[PDB]
Amino acid sequence: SPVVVEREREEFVGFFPQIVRDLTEDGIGHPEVGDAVARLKEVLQYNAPGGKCNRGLTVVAAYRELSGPGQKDAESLRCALAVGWCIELFQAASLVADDIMDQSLTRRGQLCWYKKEGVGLDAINDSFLLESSVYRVLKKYCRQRPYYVHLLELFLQTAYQTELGQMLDLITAPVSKVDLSHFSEERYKAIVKYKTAFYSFYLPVAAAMYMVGIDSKEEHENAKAILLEMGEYFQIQDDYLDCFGDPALTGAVGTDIQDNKCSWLVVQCLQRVTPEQRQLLEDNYGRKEPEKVAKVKELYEAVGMRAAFQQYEESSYRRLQELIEKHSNRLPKEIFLGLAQKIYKRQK
Amino acid sequence: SPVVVEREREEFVGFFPQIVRDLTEDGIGHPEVGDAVARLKEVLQYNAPGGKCNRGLTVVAAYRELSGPGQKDAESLRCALAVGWCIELFQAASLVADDIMDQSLTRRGQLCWYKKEGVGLDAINDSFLLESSVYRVLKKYCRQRPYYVHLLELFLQTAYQTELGQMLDLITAPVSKVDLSHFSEERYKAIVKYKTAFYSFYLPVAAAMYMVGIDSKEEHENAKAILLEMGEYFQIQDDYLDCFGDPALTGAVGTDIQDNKCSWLVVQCLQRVTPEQRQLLEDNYGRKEPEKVAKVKELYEAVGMRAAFQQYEESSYRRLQELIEKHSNRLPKEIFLGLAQKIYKRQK
Numbered sequence A, B: 001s002p003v004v005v006e007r008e009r010e011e012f013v014g015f016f017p018q019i020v021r022d023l024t025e026d027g028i029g030h031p032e033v034g035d036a037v038a039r040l041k042e043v044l045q046y047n048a049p050g051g052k053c054n055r056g057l058t059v060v061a062a063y064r065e066l067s068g069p070g071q072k073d074a075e076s077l078r079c080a081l082a083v084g085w086c087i088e089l090f091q092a093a094s095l096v097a098d099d100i101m102d103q104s105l106t107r108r109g110q111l112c113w114y115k116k117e118g119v120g121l122d123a124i125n126d127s128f129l130l131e132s133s134v135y136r137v138l139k140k141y142c143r144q145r146p147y148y149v150h151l152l153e154l155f156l157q158t159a160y161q162t163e164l165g166q167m168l169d170l171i172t173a174p175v176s177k178v179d180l181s182h183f184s185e186e187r188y189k190a191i192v193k194y195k196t197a198f199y200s201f202y203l204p205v206a207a208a209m210y211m212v213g214i215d216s217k218e219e220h221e222n223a224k225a226i227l228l229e230m231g232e233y234f235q236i237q238d239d240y241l242d243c244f245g246d247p248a249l250t251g252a253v254g255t256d257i258q259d260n261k262c263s264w265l266v267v268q269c270l271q272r273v274t275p276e277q278r279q280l281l282e283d284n285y286g287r288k289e290p291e292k293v294a295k296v297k298e299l300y301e302a303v304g305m306r307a308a309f310q311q312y313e314e315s316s317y318r319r320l321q322e323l324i325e326k327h328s329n330r331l332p333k334e335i336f337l338g339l340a341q342k343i344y345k346r347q348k
Helices: A002-013 A016-024 A034-047 A054-066 A074-100 A120-142 A148-172 A185-212 A217-244 A264-271 A275-283 A290-302 A305-327 A333-340 B002-013 B016-024 B034-047 B054-066 B074-100 B120-142 B148-172 B185-212 B217-244 B264-271 B275-283 B290-302 B305-327 B333-340
Strands: none
Touching: A002 A054, A002 A074, A016 A034, A016 A074, A016 A120, A034 A074, A034 A120, A034 B148, A054 A074, A054 A185, A054 A333, A074 A120, A074 A148, A074 A185, A074 B120, A120 A148, A120 B074, A120 B148, A148 A185, A148 B034, A148 B120, A148 B148, A185 A217, A185 A264, A185 A333, A217 A264, A217 A290, A217 A305, A217 A333, A264 A275, A264 A290, A264 A305, A275 A290, A290 A305, A305 A333, B002 B054, B002 B074, B016 B034, B016 B074, B016 B120, B034 B074, B034 B120, B054 B074, B054 B185, B054 B333, B074 B120, B074 B148, B074 B185, B120 B148, B148 B185, B185 B217, B185 B264, B185 B333, B217 B264, B217 B290, B217 B305, B217 B333, B264 B275, B264 B290, B264 B305, B275 B290, B290 B305, B305 B333
């Protein structure tokens, strides 16, 4: 529901300064480090805010579907928000780093933090601080709570998992050289499982689970199961909406495949190929040549990926509705649905 | 004692593969991420090992001075080592990053990991993984131990503190522009308090304190007090031994002040100056010009820093022997001494 979804939406956003005061307020006037904490504010404000928040929001919603009448005090509700901005600072720490290693230019419609003159390679250390900001906020909100260690272990573990998916990516599709040898489906599914799925789906729900006390191992596994198919499919749909999409498109409906970006479409091409066609690609693909690009998509339409998407889309839903069944024994399905109802949109 | 000091020394080093198997063994054959964990091994082996180990060693020694007959099982002893290699992986995560932001060339007599062809800016993510390796090892060795959360909180907090000292540094002495305006004593003392003191002295001892159960807040403060003067003085002596030293010098007795490096010597010059002399510097200092450099040190000798070092040296010892008193009420002085007996060497 708009009315509700929005309300939650706005309560989240409106909480940012708070996290901001948290992180810096007392640091701001320190006779020693005050200068540092002062640039920290800037980094925080430049980078953290401004995305969609779906990720952090997912926590709040989840706790709301999980908590009982008992646990809806205002305090509890603030931790949910706090714990929410945590995934939000986590992701920002990512993006910053990631922009340097991709030598990107823009993000969130801003110029990449590293590109800001005077900054540069210092952003290397800023993503580090953004990272520890995450643990500062938990110590501040969750320190005396039965689930503190779990959250700490939760965040840390996913940090690792995602860094490997990042690592995988970085090896597979090196941003200064084409080579489509390494573009396998297992590898794509694997780049996707670790670089975003874990922190984008599982993490948010897993945090609300432990916060209501569901620490059952095999309950984190029922969760991990459904959620990870969601996340995979989510990646895939982005990839699709990336080139074959437009109508109402989530702001910037621009692109990239000039940056030899290993995507499901690409992988799906390589399977419906001919050595010749492969060569069509092999050469061109990963190019910032207007004409070349166009041809590349001729290729995709040439092979009809437009169809395959709808083919895949039509399966993911199904598998989901089951996986819910196989996995929503103990936890409220409303969660997975809600989550799902805003993922599956489809756009062709 | 050589016999003992060495023994501990060698027990530490000989434990590395172990940490190494820990971190990767099961990652090595994963159908999904195996490739990643495999490069992780390389990163670990390239970077972690090979320094002096004083830092990690300090833990082992400390626990040995702290534990009672009860806690000297072999298991306990392994955690001390494990917990030791942790500061060692912590520092490596640092150095890697730091080499990129200084655009350094060499380290530990190896070529900087980022400089290795094929690597590059990917090292950005490798220092991240080196970082999470630290928390992997604690979860593995300390997870079911009364002091687990403290250690986790300990490491995380210092990670932050040091990142600010790094941040301070990066702003003060920007590696592509001279400006000696920002070279204050309070700032140097502050760059030193956060970028190394905390993780190089306090962290090791603080980890052995909590491991024997000394979690008393004001006992971490008695510790923090003495140790931080040690660390400061340690920095200062390096700075000194940097230019005015040689005889037996800890391997490479080369240099840097070509990289406009904010050091105690420099700061100490600016105080014994003349606007003219300041100009001698202002221009030259931070140069990779054979002749220029020489002149710079004329300046330091010109002003006689050779004397001031010995002046300062002669105070640090004193203040120490007191600070021990003011602070070694509850904890064994042997610790601070031992620590100290291998710091104060002096070299002129």
